[PDB]
C-alpha cells in the first residue's frame, strides 16, 4: 500500500518527494488540501514516517531561522513553483555580500530543506518593486498617498470608499502580496468618516473649529 494510493482518487492533487532524512514529504497547495492529507497521516493509515508541507508554512519557518543567524539580511520571498529547486529573491541594493558568502548561505538553506536539491539565489530591484505597486494603484484608480523611508515604502488608502473600490483594492493587494510578500511594501486600508464630523472649520497655521455659531475651539494647526 503506497502512500499515493491513500491520498485519494485525484492523483494530481498532491506531490510526493523523498528526502535525505529518509522521510516522505507531501507537498500541498492550500490549507484545505493540507488538512486532507494530515488527517490521513494522523489517523495512522501509513506506517513509516511522512510529513505534509506547503509554501506559507515553509516561508514562516525559514524566516524564523534567518532571524537568528542573519538578522540583517534584506530579502523578499522564497518561491516553490518547482519544489525541488526553490528560488530565493534578495535585494540588490540593501545587501553587501560576496559570492563566497552567498554560496555559504545557499548551502545552509540546502541543509534546512532536505527535500530540495539546490537553492537558486536571484537579485531583484527595489525600484522595480515600488514601481509595480504604484502602477497597480494608478491602474485601479484608487486614491492614495505614498510615504518613503530608508527601509520601506508605505501606501495609505483611506477615507470614504465605495463598495466597488473596496473590492478592487482587496483583489489587487491580495495579488501583489503573493508575488512580493509583505516585507518591503505595506498597504494601509482605513475607512474614515468625514474628518471633522460635519463642522465648519478654518484650515492652515491659524486654523480652528466652529463647535457652533458663537463657539470657537483651538485644538491644533489644521
Amino acid at each position: 500500500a503506497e502512500l499515493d494510493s491513500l491520498l485519494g482518487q485525484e492523483k494530481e492533487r498532491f506531490q510526493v518527494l523523498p528526502g535525505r532524512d529518509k522521510m516522505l514529504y507531501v507537498a500541498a497547495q492550500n490549507e484545505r488540501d493540507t488538512l486532507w492529507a494530515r488527517q490521513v497521516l494522523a489517523r495512522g493509515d501509513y506506517d513509516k514516517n511522512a510529513r505534509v508541507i506547503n509554501e506559507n508554512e515553509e516561508n514562516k519557518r525559514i524566516s524564523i531561522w534567518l532571524d537568528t543567524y542573519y538578522p540583517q539580511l534584506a530579502y523578499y520571498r522564497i518561491h516553490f513553483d518547482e519544489p525541488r529547486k526553490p528560488v530565493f529573491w534578495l535585494s540588490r541594493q540593501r545587501n553587501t555580500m560576496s559570492k563566497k558568502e552567498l554560496e555559504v548561505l545557499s548551502q545552509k538553506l540546502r541543509a534546512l530543506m532536505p527535500y530540495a536539491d539546490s537553492v537558486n539565489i536571484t537579485l531583484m530591484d527595489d525600484v522595480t518593486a515600488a514601481g509595480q505597486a504604484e502602477a497597480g494603484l494608478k491602474q485601479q484608480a484608487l486614491p492614495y498617498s505614498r510615504r518613503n523611508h530608508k527601509g520601506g515604502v508605505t501606501f495609505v488608502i483611506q477615507g470614504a470608499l465605495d463598495d466597488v473600490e473596496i473590492l478592487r483594492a482587496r483583489q489587487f493587494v491580495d495579488s501583489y502580496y503573493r508575488t512580493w510578500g509583505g516585507r518591503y511594501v505595506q498597504f494601509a486600508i482605513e475607512l474614515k468618516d468625514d474628518w471633522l464630523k460635519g463642522r465648519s472649520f478654518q484650515y492652515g497655521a491659524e486654523g480652528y473649529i466652529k463647535m457652533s455659531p458663537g463657539h470657537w475651539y483651538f485644538p491644533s494647526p489644521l
Binding site: 460635519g198 465648519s200 478654518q202 484650515y203 492652515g204 497655521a205 491659524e206 486654523g207 466652529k210 455659531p213
Partner: peptide
C-alpha cells in the same frame, strides 16, 4: 487643503462666513 488658508462652510450664515474672512 495642504497649503494656504481657507474656510470650509456648511450652510453657514453669511455673518460667520465674512467674520472668518475678516482676518485676511
Amino acid at each position: 487643503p495642504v497649503t494656504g488658508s481657507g474656510f470650509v462652510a456648511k450652510d453657514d450664515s453669511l455673518r460667520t462666513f465674512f467674520d472668518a474672512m475678516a482676518l485676511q
